[PDB]
Amino acid sequence: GTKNSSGQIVTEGNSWSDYISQIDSISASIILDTENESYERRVTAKNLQDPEDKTPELTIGEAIEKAFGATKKDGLLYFNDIPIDESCVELIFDDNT
């Protein structure tokens, strides 16, 4: 949904398909799973190879803190009174990453 000049929004001719692949070309995929729901986000990264690219980069802990709305409490990370660390969950990577 996007709004034109008259203040109303329109959903006609605006597909979601023609923004899929581009996002999956430039982003990292982060999947969280609690015991009730799941969450899946895409965060943009910095291609370090080509030097005209100006994208402000982060680390993976910063990206987890930024993507989900998660409070830094005493240095650690808390999300809906759940502790999230590198020491208190299970991390799953595929072999290339």
Binding site: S21, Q22, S25, I26, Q49, D50, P51, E52
Partner: protein, 77 residues
């Protein structure tokens, strides 16, 4: 000395001579001490705009503001 015939938005002398380089969305002269920075060299045509029959022009193709899913070796014209 900006006598570009087609409006491909770039210097015809930097077209027909040595080359050029898109930096900060503008086209500057090709320097010989730029390969270490990561920049590359592009050589193109002036008498026509789309010098390979792509749907995009040279200025759309060098400065990669055309489609972000295109692989990076399809950047040079």
């Amino acid at each position: 000395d900006e006598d570009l015939d087609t409006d491909n938005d770039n210097i015809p002398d930097s077209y027909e001579r040595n080359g050029y380089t898109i930096k900060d969305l503008i086209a500057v002269k090709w320097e010989d001490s730029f390969a270490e920075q990561g920049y590359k060299k592009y050589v193109s045509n002036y008498l026509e705009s789309n010098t390979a029959g792509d749907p995009y022009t040279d200025y759309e193709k060098a400065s990669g503001s055309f489609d972000k899913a295109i692989k990076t070796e399809a950047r040079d014209p």
